[PDB]
Amino acid sequence: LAIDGRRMQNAVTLLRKIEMIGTTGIGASAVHLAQSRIVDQMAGRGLIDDS
Amino acid sequence: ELLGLGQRRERVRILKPTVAHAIIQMWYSWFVEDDRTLAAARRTSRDDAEK
Structure with a gap:
């Protein structure tokens, strides 16, 4: 218990950190752009095409 | 002839x-514009609802 708490105070914090840093905005841009290529990936196929 | 009064x-x-030239000319384009667009949507979305 103690251990998860330390590792995962790291875990948690790093995780929270990640979320935030990524919602920096540009990155959010990556989110629309990378998505879209992935949309292409999401929409390469017909079946996949429903995005 | 449409005036057709002789001769x-x-x-x-x-x-x-x-x-009118200008006005009708915007006309020429949009019946154009849209059509192209609708046509295109029918093309890939693609999929029943749109067409």
């Missing part, structure tokens, strides 16, 4: 009077 009038001159 020719020798030197009636008209302005190439404008305005």
